[PDB]
């Protein structure tokens, strides 16, 4: 039975997430700007829905038929604790707890990013240990469990140099 | 976590153990087969076994792992330390689970009385199950943290509560 982790896939300059056999979500800035296909499908066959730093792809055929469809929502209630599902090219999997806040336009290393704010709950400074995000992590999904149901609520768009603050881009 | 730490994590009995040095191997007592008389092709005679509850240390007369340097083993860590539990999963995926350590504790978990250093997972809010939390096959995985320029091992995985949010480190 396929884990959540099998849905996290290397893509462009970062990552994305399979919501169902036909639906893939990612951060807009990691998508190649020169392409004629993705995952073997011509771009003519792909519906692309862009909303700021959130992009959804809907494929005309089943790319990941091994998966069931899961619930995608437009962010989550303020105060929800989500996990960001970070994969690294070493083969490490780094699920990190994040407390989610308001939807806002936030100044992150001198640039405006719009999405749902969050604060990492892994403590003082990750630097040294596997406790924080890095630039190559963009497009990792934000997920949480709600009774028996898993929910995905957005994708990793930005983080401060400091480490504490992240932005989860969300569906419009 | 550094490659040399992952190199020390060894599939053993019904779980894992960890090479502290060329001659010293630590594990959780319950993953050792009750009938076993040989370890790394050496007989019991040629091994010094030091057992304290669910913590077992093996000291070999011969260098079994001459590729390794000896590192620091401590008796648990200060309350408040964030550790990584070095868990290997189905296919070369490496899961360094973040945990905030607390007090020494005595608990009853399912059918067992367990004693060691308690902690709480920092991977998400509802960690039960294999994606964000521990499973029974994880017993013996090491708890490690970075101190200034050194890494330390401070225990081995012994148990997790029914909810999966609390874990127990067996300590020397
Ligand atoms: N919820 C909340 C409310 C106030 C301050 C922190 C908070 O996070 C809770 C929390 C959950 C998982 C792992 C660590 C912490």
B65 and B88 share one domain? no
Q: Are B81 and B128 in contact (CB under 8 A)?
A: no
Residues of B forming the active site:
30, 54, 139
Measured CA to CA, the distance from residue B16 to residue B28 in angstroms comes to: 8
Buried b (16+ CB within 10 A) or exposed e, A86-115: bbeeeeebbbbbbebbeeeebebeeeebbb
Ligand 1 nearest atom to the CA of residue A99, by list position: 8
Residues A94 and A134 in one domain: yes
The residue whose two tokens read 């620091």 is B72
Distance between CA B153 and CA B65 in Å, rounded? 17
Catalytic residue among A37, A41, A49, A53: A53
Claim to verify: residue B32 and residue B79 sit in the same structural domain:
no
| Chain centroid offset of residue B126 CA | 22
Q: Which residue segment(s) compose the domain that A119 sits in?
A: 70-172
Question: CA of A70: how far to CAs of A86, A88, B109, in Å?
Answer: 19, 24, 33
Residue A35 Cα to ligand 1 middle (Å): 42
- Residues A60 and A22: their CA atoms lie apart, in Å, by 7
Contact A90 B92 (CB under 8 A): no
Cross-chain residue pair B146–A123, CB shorter than 8 Å: no
Residue B122 Cβ < 6 Å to ligand 1: yes
Pairing of the two strands A149-159 and A71-72: parallel
* Experimental approach: X-ray
Q: Which atom of ligand 1 is found nearest the CA of B125?
A: 12
- CB contacts under 8 A, B 107-166 vs A, are 121-126, 130-132, 145-146
**Domain co-membership, B13 together with B25:** yes
Of A30, A48, A69, which residue sits at a domain end? A69
Say if residue A49 is in the same domain as residue A97.
Answer: no
For a mutational test of ligand 1's pocket, the pick from B121, B122, B163, i.e. the residue with the most ligand atoms closer than 8 A to its C-beta, is: B122
Tokens in use for B53?
């509850």
In terms of domains, do B54 and B134 share one? no
Rounded distance between C-alpha atoms, residue A28 and residue A138, angstroms: 10
Q: Give the whole-angstrom CA distance, residue B16 versus residue A123.
A: 28
Annotate B6-29 with DSSP letters as a single string: HHHEEEETTEEEEESSSSEEEEEG
Instruction: Identify whether residues B81 and B145 lie together within a single domain.
Output: yes
User: Residue A26's closest CA among A13, A39, A43?
Assistant: A13
| Catalytic choice (A76, A82, A138, A168) | A138
> How many Å apart are CA A159 and CA A135, to the nearest integer?
8
Structure tokens at B102: 């607390």
CA nearest to A97, candidates A70, A77, A118, A125: A118
Closest CA to A23 of A54, A48, A52: A48
Nearest-CA residue for ligand 1 atom 12 is B125
Instruction: Give the torsion through C-alpha atoms of A89, A91, A96, A100, to 10 deg.
Output: 50
CA B91/CA A146 separation, integer angstroms: 28
What's the resolution in A? 1.4
DSSP letter (8 states) at residue B2: -
CB B98 within 8 A of CB B120: no
**Claim to verify: residue B146 and residue B109 sit in the same structural domain:** yes
Question: Taking a C-beta distance cutoff of 8 angstroms, is the pair B23, B63 a contact?
Answer: yes
* DSSP class of A124: S
Residues B123 and B171 in one domain: yes
Whether B14 contacts B139, CB under 8 Å: yes
A81 ligand 1 Cβ < 6 A: yes
Query: What's phi and psi for B14, nearest 5 deg?
Result: -90, 15
Q: Is the dihedral of CA B129, B130, B131, B132 positive or negative?
A: positive
Last residue of a domain, one of B25, B48, B70: B70
Q: Which token pair is A33?
A: 């700007």
Distance CA B125, CA B102 (A): 17
Q: Are A22 and A66 in contact (CB under 8 A)?
A: no
Question: Is the CB of residue A5 less than 8 Å away from at least one CB of chain B?
Answer: yes
C-beta atoms of A94 and B92 within 8 A = no
Do A86 and A153 share a domain, yes or no?
yes
B139 and B18 Cβ atoms separated by less than 8 Å: no
B5 and B76 together in one domain: no
Q: Are A144 and A80 in contact (CB under 8 A)?
A: yes
A97 with B145: Cβ contact below 8 A: no
Are the beta carbons of A18 and A59 closer than 8 angstroms?
A: no
- What's the sign of the alpha-carbon dihedral A65, A14, A26, A12? negative
- State how far the Cα of B16 lies from the Cα of B26, in Å rounded to an integer: 9
CB A115 within 8 A of CB A154: yes
What residues of A are in contact with residue B1 (Cβ under 8 Å)? 92, 129-130
- The candidate with the shortest Cα–Cα distance to B109, out of B154, B166, B156, is B166
Burial of B151 (0-12, 13-18, 19+ CB in 10 A): middle
User: Under a CB-based contact definition with an 8 Å cutoff, are residues A98 and A166 in contact?
Assistant: yes
What residues does B10 pair with on adjacent strands? B17
Gap between the Cα atoms of B130 and B138, Å rounded: 10
Does residue B130 contact residue B136 with C-beta atoms inside 8 Å?
no
Q: Which two tokens stand for residue A139?
A: 């497009």
Looking at the fold, whether A167 and A100 belong to one and the same domain comes out as yes
Between CA A7 and CA A10, with CA A8 as vertex, the angle to 5 degrees is 130
The structural domain count of chain B equals: 2
Question: Where does A19-137 show beta strands of DSSP type E?
Answer: 23-27, 37-38, 41-42, 46-51, 54-59, 71-72, 81-87, 93-108, 111-120
Alpha carbon distances (Å) from B114 to B78, B97, B110, B118, B167:
20, 21, 10, 10, 11
* Among A38, A69, A100, residue at a domain's last position: A69
* Shortest alpha-carbon distance between residue B128 and chain A (Å): 10
Tell which residue, B98, B84, B1, B17, has the closest CA to residue A90: B1
**What are the residues whose beta carbons fall under 8 Å from the beta carbon of A11, sequence distance 6 or more?**
A24, A26, A30, A31, A38, A139
């Amino acid at each position: 039975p396929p884990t959540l982790w099998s849905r996290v896939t290397k893509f462009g300059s970062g990552w994305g997430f399979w919501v169902s056999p036909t639906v893939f979500i990612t951060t807009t800035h990691v998508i190649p700007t020169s392409a004629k296909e993705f995952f073997g499908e011509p771009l003519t066959s792909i519906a692309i829905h862009r909303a700021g730093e959130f992009t959804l792809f809907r494929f005309s055929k089943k790319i990941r038929p091994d998966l069931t469809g899961m619930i995608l929502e437009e962010g989550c209630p303020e105060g929800t604790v989500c996990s960001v599902l970070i994969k690294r090219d070493s083969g490490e999997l780094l699920p990190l707890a994040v407390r989610m806040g308001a939807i806002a336009s936030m100044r992150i290393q001198g640039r405006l990013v719009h999405g749902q704010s969050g604060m990492l709950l892994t403590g003082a400074n990750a630097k040294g240990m596997d406790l924080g995000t890095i630039p190559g992590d963009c497009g990792a999904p934000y997920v949480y469990k709600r009774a028996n149901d898993w929910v995905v609520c957005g994708v990793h768009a930005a983080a401060t140099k400091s480490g504490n603050t992240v932005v989860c881009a969300v569906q419009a």
